[PDB]
Amino acid sequence: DWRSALTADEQRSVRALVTATTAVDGVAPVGEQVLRELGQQRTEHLLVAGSGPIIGYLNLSPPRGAGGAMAELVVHPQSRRRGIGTAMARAALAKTAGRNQFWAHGTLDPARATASALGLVGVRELIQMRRPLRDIPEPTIPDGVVIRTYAGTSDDAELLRVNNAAFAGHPEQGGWTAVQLAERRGEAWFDPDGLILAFGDSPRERPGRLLGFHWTKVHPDHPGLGEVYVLGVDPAAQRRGLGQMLTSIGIVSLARRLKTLDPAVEPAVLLYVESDNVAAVRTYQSLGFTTYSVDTAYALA
Ligand SMILES: CC(=O)SCCNC(=O)CCNC(=O)[C@H](O)C(C)(C)COP(=O)(O)OP(=O)(O)OC[C@H]1O[C@@H](n2cnc3c(N)ncnc32)[C@H](O)[C@@H]1OP(=O)(O)O
Ligand SMILES: N[C@@H](CS)C(=O)N[C@H]1[C@@H](O[C@@H]2[C@H](O)[C@H](O)[C@@H](O)[C@H](O)[C@H]2O)O[C@H](CO)[C@@H](O)[C@@H]1O
């Protein structure tokens, strides 16, 4: 039975399934956007009850922007190999007439095996890379560039202009409106001091225009973990060293934010990047990031 919205109680039950599974598998089974979708009316949901907590959950997001339908799903660790995962995946495939993809975060063995049993193949590879926060860079800020941080909604127009130009065609990051910014500003981890903006200054043709930005994020449920959450440079100002510079500034910012009674943890910064985004992979390789895990999107061949 598909539901177009979930009650507060249903949301609490799905969240418990997701967090419990994250602890057992070592990787969250559904992404952050699915957790935001639990309380909105934009997607469709399947809930599978035991004989009785919720033991299976699938979210199906419809096409939006340049992207197609996408499903994420999870089955309680103690209810696996009972056919629930197959049942939910077949339902989504039948509902979209075989057109949706499925994310397997961390591309764990059970998901690889389920994908083969269903006849699916990997069609998209999202790599998670990490770099320790030791030996931080000294960033070089070129003349004609001034850096500052997010001041509030007066900065949204420029941020959206640069985001949509840099991510034109990106299935999830492109074609944003003020609503996408607002839903992330309401997240517990949002910190205006961690959204770094690079503006053109007098020397350049367009003083005051945003050239690029680096939105950093500190993970709340993982001590010592930061993220290059969104990094983007206006196409008009690309290939001039600004991406490398912005990434370095954000690493410095995170290093500063991440005593005797603090647990010993070697802090690290992670990022996600499409395997075929050549420009970005080169920028990150240059700065010492290395592969950590892979998220694979599966679909009909
Ligand atoms: C294509 C995808 O599954 S993308 C979904 C990604 N989600 C995740 O990876 C989240 C964490 N994992 C889970 O929630 C679950 O392990 C799932 C959803 C991947 C599979 O859920 P389950 O309900 O256990 O799947 P299901 O019982 O239908 O298994 C179907 C077949 O896949 C294979 N399979 C599933 N898990 C495994 C495993 N751990 N080892 C080997 N084969 C497996 C088997 O052939 C199985 O049939 P069988 O039990 O008769 O041998
Ligand atoms: N870096 C951008 C542009 S390359 C990107 O690729 N980000 C990716 C990444 O976002 C992740 C967030 O960054 C991370 O904070 C959160 O914890 C995860 O659950 C995902 O929401 O994974 C998503 C798929 O799961 C994808 O839709 C998105 O574009």
mmCIF file of C-alpha atoms and ligand atoms in Angstrom, residues 28 30-34 36 72 103 105 124 126-127 167 170-173 184 189 217 219 227-231 270-274 277 280 284 295, ligand 2:
data_model
loop_
_atom_site.group_PDB
_atom_site.id
_atom_site.type_symbol
_atom_site.label_atom_id
_atom_site.label_comp_id
_atom_site.label_asym_id
_atom_site.label_seq_id
_atom_site.Cartn_x
_atom_site.Cartn_y
_atom_site.Cartn_z
ATOM 1 C CA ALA A 28 23.113 4.802 6.740
ATOM 2 C CA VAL A 30 18.952 5.899 3.160
ATOM 3 C CA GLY A 31 20.407 9.370 2.490
ATOM 4 C CA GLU A 32 19.758 12.627 4.261
ATOM 5 C CA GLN A 33 17.276 13.786 1.621
ATOM 6 C CA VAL A 34 15.055 10.759 2.398
ATOM 7 C CA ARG A 36 13.843 15.240 5.070
ATOM 8 C CA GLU A 72 16.040 3.990 -1.329
ATOM 9 C CA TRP A 103 20.750 3.681 -4.224
ATOM 10 C CA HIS A 105 24.953 3.355 -0.022
ATOM 11 C CA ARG A 124 26.009 5.436 -11.415
ATOM 12 C CA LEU A 126 29.132 8.077 -6.276
ATOM 13 C CA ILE A 127 32.514 7.868 -4.562
ATOM 14 C CA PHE A 167 25.131 22.282 -11.331
ATOM 15 C CA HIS A 170 22.905 17.581 -12.003
ATOM 16 C CA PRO A 171 20.023 15.304 -10.992
ATOM 17 C CA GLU A 172 19.853 16.438 -7.405
ATOM 18 C CA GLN A 173 21.935 19.571 -7.040
ATOM 19 C CA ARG A 184 18.866 22.879 4.784
ATOM 20 C CA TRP A 189 24.056 21.027 11.438
ATOM 21 C CA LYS A 217 29.048 20.577 7.060
ATOM 22 C CA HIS A 219 28.274 15.650 10.919
ATOM 23 C CA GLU A 227 32.314 17.447 4.831
ATOM 24 C CA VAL A 228 32.847 19.404 1.631
ATOM 25 C CA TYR A 229 29.018 19.355 1.336
ATOM 26 C CA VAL A 230 28.555 21.520 -1.794
ATOM 27 C CA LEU A 231 31.465 23.064 -3.706
ATOM 28 C CA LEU A 270 34.810 13.483 3.591
ATOM 29 C CA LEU A 271 33.083 14.392 0.326
ATOM 30 C CA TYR A 272 30.988 12.660 -2.323
ATOM 31 C CA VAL A 273 31.711 12.992 -6.000
ATOM 32 C CA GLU A 274 30.433 11.266 -9.167
ATOM 33 C CA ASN A 277 33.165 14.267 -12.722
ATOM 34 C CA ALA A 280 36.346 17.657 -9.406
ATOM 35 C CA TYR A 284 40.362 16.532 -4.804
ATOM 36 C CA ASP A 295 27.602 4.359 -3.333
HETATM 37 N N1 LIG B 2 28.978 16.770 -3.144
HETATM 38 C C1 LIG B 2 27.676 16.865 -3.785
HETATM 39 C C2 LIG B 2 27.914 17.434 -5.204
HETATM 40 S S1 LIG B 2 29.224 16.368 -6.077
HETATM 41 C C3 LIG B 2 27.075 15.449 -3.873
HETATM 42 O O1 LIG B 2 27.539 14.607 -4.619
HETATM 43 N N2 LIG B 2 26.164 15.079 -2.933
HETATM 44 C C4 LIG B 2 25.391 13.795 -3.086
HETATM 45 C C5 LIG B 2 25.414 13.047 -1.796
HETATM 46 O O2 LIG B 2 24.765 13.832 -0.751
HETATM 47 C C6 LIG B 2 25.037 13.355 0.547
HETATM 48 C C7 LIG B 2 25.298 14.565 1.505
HETATM 49 O O3 LIG B 2 26.421 15.292 0.990
HETATM 50 C C8 LIG B 2 25.680 14.069 2.886
HETATM 51 O O4 LIG B 2 25.895 15.163 3.769
HETATM 52 C C9 LIG B 2 24.566 13.163 3.448
HETATM 53 O O5 LIG B 2 25.005 12.638 4.669
HETATM 54 C C10 LIG B 2 24.253 11.992 2.474
HETATM 55 O O6 LIG B 2 23.204 11.167 3.004
HETATM 56 C C11 LIG B 2 23.870 12.505 1.072
HETATM 57 O O7 LIG B 2 22.671 13.375 1.111
HETATM 58 O O8 LIG B 2 24.668 11.795 -1.977
HETATM 59 C C12 LIG B 2 23.326 11.915 -2.498
HETATM 60 C C13 LIG B 2 22.783 10.511 -2.679
HETATM 61 O O9 LIG B 2 22.774 9.871 -1.430
HETATM 62 C C14 LIG B 2 23.247 12.736 -3.804
HETATM 63 O O10 LIG B 2 21.844 12.978 -4.127
HETATM 64 C C15 LIG B 2 23.935 14.072 -3.540
HETATM 65 O O11 LIG B 2 23.954 14.819 -4.753
#
